[PDB]
Write a new protein. Structure first.
Length: 376
């Protein structure tokens, strides 16, 4: 169903349904389409906006006071877009989920689903355009609290051989929190993980588009990478609270001004990298402060876990593998002095980091850095 030069608001309660389904590609040209009062959006063929178009999705209002037993009996919210996403010529996709307020983090992770999972045609935002997503909030039990259940959203697609799912963000991708920083000035740990990109990238498979991640990328959550979505883009610049490179990533610059995260009485950065990472990662606003824990965590496997160590010189942080004698550096913006220590997980007490839309491999080891005072 195509829409031309129109302004239509489609309303679930007026219509008598909380499912808004469209089986054909949802095409907008010079139109503003608003979807209010829907609990389920299913667009298995994707959306295609152009010529100053606007897709507005607003989670239906809720005045219910946030409670535990309400969260159990709550209907589920789910928005799944498949196929392809295209936003061209100054168009916008504006999702707002602030009306959705949960009492506990693990409940938010199952009663809220936001899944852009495209295929061979991928996600495309022209540099004129914007994709803006305002998240729900939850009141307790965030990333610095108990394990396993970590709320997330996915922006990307799965790989289906031989077709990669491309990610082309020339414009603005912006994910916002609907809650404010705490009264102490920091975002608290009531975060969403933002799974960006595909599960894997076959450099030899087909790209209906090479990836390009040069646009305005600003995510108020824990970004999560499972494939090297940055290879082939120079001068990537990401503003986020933290991130999670579960696969090695190519050179980018990440600005952590919105970190560190406040939770359970302490501050910490949420920066994880994994085995295979090597040279090219630049961090901005990584503060060198004793009251901030875990500036960098490095997850890996080894038969001799002591093989990986860390040392900082001035503003450079070196991760050293003494087995292979290779080393790689993370380049910050201040003078750092660090110590390192280890965490080791087992097949029966595993670590799955902050979770993932795709199944996170088991990293039995974890090299953890911490700030120590600088030698005069």
């Amino acid at each position: 169903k195509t829409y031309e030069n129109q302004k239509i608001v489609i309303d679930g309660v007026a219509l008598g349904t909380t499912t808004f389904e469209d089986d054909e590609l949802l095409v907008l040209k010079n139109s503003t389409l608003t979807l209010n009062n829907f609990m389920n959006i299913k667009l298995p063929a994707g959306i295609s906006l152009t010529d100053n178009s606007v897709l507005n999705i607003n989670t239906p209002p809720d005045d219910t006071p946030p409670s535990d037993s309400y969260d159990v009996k709550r209907p589920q919210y789910s928005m799944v877009i498949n196929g392809k996403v295209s936003i061209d010529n100054g168009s916008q996709f504006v999702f707002d989920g602030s009306s959705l307020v949960y009492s506990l983090g693990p409940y938010a992770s199952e009663k809220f689903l936001f899944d852009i999972n495209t295929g061979m045609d991928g996600i495309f935002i022209s540099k004129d355009s914007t994709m803006r997503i305002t998240l729900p909030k939850y009141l307790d039990w965030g990333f610095s609290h108990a394990t396993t259940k970590f709320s997330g959203i996915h922006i990307g697609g799965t790989y289906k051989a031989p077709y990669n799912s491309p990610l082309v963000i020339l414009g603005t991708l912006e994910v916002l929190r609907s809650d404010s920083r705490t009264d102490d000035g920091y975002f608290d740990d009531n975060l969403f993980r933002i799974d960006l990109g595909p599960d894997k990238i076959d450099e030899n498979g087909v790209f209906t588009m090479k990836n390009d991640l040069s646009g305005n990328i600003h995510c108020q959550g824990i970004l999560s990478f499972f494939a090297d979505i940055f290879k082939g883009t120079d001068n990537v610049f990401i503003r986020t609270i933290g991130f999670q490179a579960i696969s090695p990533i190519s050179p980018i610059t990440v600005d952590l001004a919105e970190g560190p995260v406040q939770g359970n009485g302490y501050l910490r950065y949420n920066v994880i990298i994994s085995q295979g990472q090597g040279n090219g990662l630049k961090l901005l606003n990584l503060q060198a402060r004793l009251d901030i824990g875990l500036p960098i965590i490095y997850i890996y496997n080894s038969d001799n876990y002591k093989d990986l160590t860390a040392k900082a010189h001035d503003n450079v942080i070196d991760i050293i593998d003494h087995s292979s004698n290779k080393s790689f550096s993370i380049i910050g913006d201040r003078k750092y002095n660090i110590t390192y220590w280890y965490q080791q997980y087992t097949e029966i007490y595993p670590s799955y980091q902050y979770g993932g839309y795709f199944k996170v491999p088991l990293f039995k080891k974890s090299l953890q850095l911490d700030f120590i005072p600088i030698i005069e």
